Amino acid sequence: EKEVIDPMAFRRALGNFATGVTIMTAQTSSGERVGVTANSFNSVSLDPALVLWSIDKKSSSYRIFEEATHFGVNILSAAQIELSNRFARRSEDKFANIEFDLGVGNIPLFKNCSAAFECERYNIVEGGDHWIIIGRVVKFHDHGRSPLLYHQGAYSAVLPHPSLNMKSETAEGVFPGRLYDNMYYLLTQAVRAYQNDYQPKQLASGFRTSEARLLLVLESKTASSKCDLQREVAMPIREIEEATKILSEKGLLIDNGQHYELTEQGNACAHMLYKIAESHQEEVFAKYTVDERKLFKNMLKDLIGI
Amino acid sequence: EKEVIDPMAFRRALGNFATGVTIMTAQTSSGERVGVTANSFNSVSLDPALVLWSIDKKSSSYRIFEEATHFGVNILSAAQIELSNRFARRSEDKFANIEFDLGVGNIPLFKNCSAAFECERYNIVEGGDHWIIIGRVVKFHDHGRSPLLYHQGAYSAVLPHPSLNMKSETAEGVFPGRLYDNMYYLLTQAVRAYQNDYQPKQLASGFRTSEARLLLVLESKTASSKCDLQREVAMPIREIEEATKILSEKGLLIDNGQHYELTEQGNACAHMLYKIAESHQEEVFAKYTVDERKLFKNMLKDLIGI
Numbered sequence A, B: 001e002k003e004v005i006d007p008m009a010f011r012r013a014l015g016n017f018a019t020g021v022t023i024m025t026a027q028t029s030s031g032e033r034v035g036v037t038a039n040s041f042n043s044v045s046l047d048p049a050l051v052l053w054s055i056d057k058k059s060s061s062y063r064i065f066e067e068a069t070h071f072g073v074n075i076l077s078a079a080q081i082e083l084s085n086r087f088a089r090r091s092e093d094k095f096a097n098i099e100f101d102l103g104v105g106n107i108p109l110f111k112n113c114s115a116a117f118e119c120e121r122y123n124i125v126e127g128g129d130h131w132i133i134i135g136r137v138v139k140f141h142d143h144g145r146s147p148l149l150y151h152q153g154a155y156s157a158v159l160p161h162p163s164l165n166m167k168s169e170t171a172e173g174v175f176p177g178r179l180y181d182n183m184y185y186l187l188t189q190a191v192r193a194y195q196n197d198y199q200p201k202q203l204a205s206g207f208r209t210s211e212a213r214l215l216l217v218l219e220s221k222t223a224s225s226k227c228d229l230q231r232e233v234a235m236p237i238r239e240i241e242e243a244t245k246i247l248s249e250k251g252l253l254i255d256n257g258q259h260y261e262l263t264e265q266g267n268a269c270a271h272m273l274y275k276i277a278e279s280h281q282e283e284v285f286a287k288y289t290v291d292e293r294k295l296f297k298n299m300l301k302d303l304i305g306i
């Protein structure tokens, strides 16, 4: 006896494992290039230096990866969401107007990535409805740029710094070291404390990141179109479609032909998410004047540059 | 003669791919049980439901994963750094004083995780100095808790929210939607902008996250133990040892046998990292009074709870 696994509910469960984001590329001697956004990448071995990913067996790009003797792994930085979206959708020329260099074996390498790996195709292994492609790394580029994150269906970023030592007996002892008493560290630890308050409440009310973002954006109806919407929620199109379907089942959203609109329940759920977020600062700043609180927001906007 | 890339430079480069953190567990019919912290996990296939990970061929736990018919994947939450560290070090009893449940095939399952996957051992594939273990998922748990991240040798958290539209001619148009105009959103965008200023300057200096943290902490924690140090910098032991070896070869750190100590050049680098962080806010808040900046800092600390 083997258990039947629902594939969409299993896909949602996998969204709990955060990953960076890559684009796998290859080009033949002929001149045919492929590039495929992928988060199935991981490392295997240091010597020999080996990495792997999993490509759909129905992919139109599989033939080129199978034939080309070399392929590249581009680790996207936080600034490359547009690249990630371009190479996630079939089109006539995914590379149109992209700048890229040629590594060994004609590997296409994008500029401004967090890192890149030039691989020789090493082995191809059966993987259910995917093929597992194992590559030997023969060259790499390590730039260190802050990476693009993919988690619970949505694009995010890495929050810097180790946490405060919150059981310390001394006042300055809360900092991991005294040079962490600085404005940058304080801001990251304020975010971390806000998230620790807000996140469990959002989750206990039954919303995951991708659902939450669609509710908050669709409530305001600011350019409610498919390309405009993707840009605002920072999610893949495949994840927008999946998340509007769930919201539809919860009675929160209507998919009227071309665009999406919340229902009255959906509007109330969006507003409930706002009140949760605003709850923490309401409590923490209850004893500050309106002027002080107005001032705090303005200094925040000054660091942001708005 | 066989040419290979430097394994330790390669490991550093792989640090650019962010991942979650798992513990892999198994218990055989004879009662032998294992748990291994791992971040080589990823998904393979939706139908059949397949995932994989890679384990070191010299692992003393491999024999039990090879014997057990079933194994678990526990996706760790942000609050489980202690569990992560516990299951990353060889030990007489990793499971001592740890609460856990048993799944199918007596899989050890930990409490308070982000998610967990019960697998039947499906296939073991040659992986250089690792074995690639493929699992068929027979049951999953989807809790959605904020995840533990691992990036450039160190533990971090997720920075939430879609980025604001910096090219907006209107104040409202900056936000992905109007309900994102709240304190929590503004804090995360503040962190984003700060990091976009700080990060390329820390990179230009040659430091990755693991090195930077060690510098900042060791600059004032001149006598910390190896346990306290792991807790303070939020890095596993194995990364601390790798990072201090790099810092030693750069001339920034000495290992006198008992403790780690920064050199004169190490101290100067720690203070430079501090200046970079402090310089952004110093420029932006120049126009505010001495007491206005004091008020801002005090309000941040109220948010934190210190």
Ligand SMILES: Cc1cc2nc3c(=O)[nH]c(=O)nc-3n(C[C@H](O)[C@H](O)[C@H](O)COP(=O)(O)O)c2cc1C
Pocket (backbone or CB within 6 Å): A021, A035, A036, A037, A038, A039, A040, A041, A053, A054, A055, A056, A058, A059, A060, A061, A062, A087, A088, A089, A090, A150, A236, A238
């Ligand atoms: C975040 C993200 C991760 C993805 N990861 C993978 C992957 O690991 N493997 C895969 O085959 N497709 C993945 N895709 C989908 C492919 O990008 C998509 O099928 C492909 O670009 C379609 O073009 P093709 O049919 O020419 O391959 C991913 C898409 C997104 C948005």
Ligand SMILES: Cc1cc2nc3c(=O)[nH]c(=O)nc-3n(C[C@H](O)[C@H](O)[C@H](O)COP(=O)(O)O)c2cc1C
Pocket (backbone or CB within 6 Å): B021, B035, B036, B037, B038, B039, B040, B041, B053, B054, B055, B056, B059, B060, B061, B062, B084, B087, B088, B089, B090, B091, B150, B236, B238
């Ligand atoms: C964040 C992190 C990720 C790790 N990932 C892996 C991995 O993917 N594969 C592996 O074999 N070991 C990995 N390790 C190391 C093992 O956890 C460690 O070697 C093991 O627990 C040693 O015990 P054993 O010799 O009894 O297996 C990782 C350690 C850490 C801290």
